[PDB]
């Protein structure tokens, strides 16, 4: 299965969006598109309490033909937000394009930002998936710092590498800055598509650099030969059905 | 009003612990003595969720007469833990001695530590202090490093100064040690003693070099002559009384 940008290619095909597995098709998928003035809010969405988002150390990373992987290994864990269990960090990536408004998967009034960071929680519902937007800025990210380094050395899929000491923590916009946010049940936005995953987006994005930015577009690669840059491996919004989306504030 | 190590003046006296005004007699005093294989647990004590905690900037430092005041007007809130509404952080303060083993107003099974840090909040029940053990440690806390080099210069009560650029979270131990902690009603520990107090004691101690430790009794004064240096600014413990103490632990 691959992205649209990987079927033009005439020589050799395979399953774009439009012909996904099975379960990709159902009745609540995601990613969509948040309208705002439309969202029910729900008290019990009080802030996650984030435990080992601060404790710093090497992250093993790797290009796994879709997206930059960075495994947390159950490093960190959170717990609240009305989730039933407590959620344990299992990996992080991302999703981009070229441009700085049509790179992130979901949207918010039908603006879409520059990347989309993914931090995927397995339930210890089922999966407790946190996105955040990302924005280019005019200035450097340091937190970011880190992650950006280590793509020179995973070029091609399934290239293997680590991460120089850093925290989760460090990468997201600070604590005072995520109590609003949205809640919604959906799916993974990859094949199979399964609808096991308790969405929250945050609505204050994430600020990098325009060349920390380029760097992923430049160093990444979709295949083994490197002829395709890896890029807009986004998936197109999805019908809301008939889901409501919640949030944190009033 | 003062403590015990302040009447040994045979010039001037003062109300010592024994003769506090009222309130200070009540039947639901602090400190107390927790006896851990004696609490009832509670699942709803959940870890606090700390914001505004990582922010990093100058905090406003005096010595009161009593202990080294640091002002944290309202810059940090804490949500949860079975609290009834939010909490603002106000100011922080430490209780100490000059051995490792007897300068903690609290103890937990008979055992008394080096130090006792108090932060205070109010509500925004009334006030919600976390009460953290100081231990002298073989190693430097670079965290509390910004607030000892302060202390030389506020040696005389009331007067005032300021910390270099520090945050309050790198003051407390890690995220993954605040899991355990202990709950009950009681009071202020100094007059005039009011029983609207929500204490909340930590089982994890934090660490601080012996130099460091040292350098709170040398430097600060309780009085204007600079005659008695400061510390057993202690208050003894108090009867439990019929109050029921709880952890966050099963
Ligand atoms: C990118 C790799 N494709 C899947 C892989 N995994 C699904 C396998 C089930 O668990 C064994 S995953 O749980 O790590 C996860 S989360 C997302 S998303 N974009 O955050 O909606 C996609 C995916
Ligand atoms: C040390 C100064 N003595 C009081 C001052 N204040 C009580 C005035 C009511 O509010 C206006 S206080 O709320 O800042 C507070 S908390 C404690 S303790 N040791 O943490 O139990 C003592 C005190
Ligand atoms: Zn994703
Ligand atoms: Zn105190």
Same mark, same amino acid.
């Given at each position: ?10 020589? @050799? ?27 029910? =809010? ?8 984030? =435990?080992?988002? &601060? ?8 290009? +796994?033909?879709?997206? =930059? ?12 937000? &009305? ?75 399934? @290239? ?24 919604? /049940? ?5 094949? /199979? ?17 325009? +060349? ?20 807009? +491996? =986004? ?16």
């Amino acid at each position: 299965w691959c992205y649209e940008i990987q079927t033009e290619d005439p020589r @050799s095909s395979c399953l774009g969006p439009e012909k996904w597995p099975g379960a990709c098709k159902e009745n609540q998928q995601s990613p969509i598109n948040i309208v705002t003035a439309r969202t029910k =809010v729900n008290p019990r969405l009080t802030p996650f309490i984030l =435990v080992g988002y &601060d404790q710093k150390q090497q992250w093993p990373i790797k290009n +796994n033909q879709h997206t =930059v992987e960075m495994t947390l290994g159950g490093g960190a864990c959170i717990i609240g937000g &009305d989730l039933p269990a407590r959620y344990e960090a299992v990996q992080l990536h991302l999703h981009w394009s070229n441009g700085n408004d049509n790179g992130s998967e979901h949207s918010i009034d039908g603006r879409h930002f520059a990347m989309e960071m993914h931090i995927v929680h397995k339930k210890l519902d089922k999966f407790a998936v946190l996105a955040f937007m990302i924005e280019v800025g005019d200035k450097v990210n340091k937190g970011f710092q880190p992650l950006v380094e280590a793509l020179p050395s995973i070029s091609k899929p399934h @290239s293997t590498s680590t991460v120089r000491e850093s925290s989760l923590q460090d990468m997201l916009p600070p604590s005072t800055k995520m109590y609003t946010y949205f809640r919604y /049940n959906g799916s993974l936005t990859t094949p /199979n598509c399964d609808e096991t995953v308790i969405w929250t987006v945050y609505k204050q994005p994430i600020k990098i650099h325009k +060349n920390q930015f380029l760097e992923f577009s430049k160093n990444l690669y979709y295949d083994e030969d490197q002829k395709l840059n890896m890029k807009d +491996n =986004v998936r197109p919004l999805q019908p809301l059905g008939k889901r409501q989306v919640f949030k944190s504030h009033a």
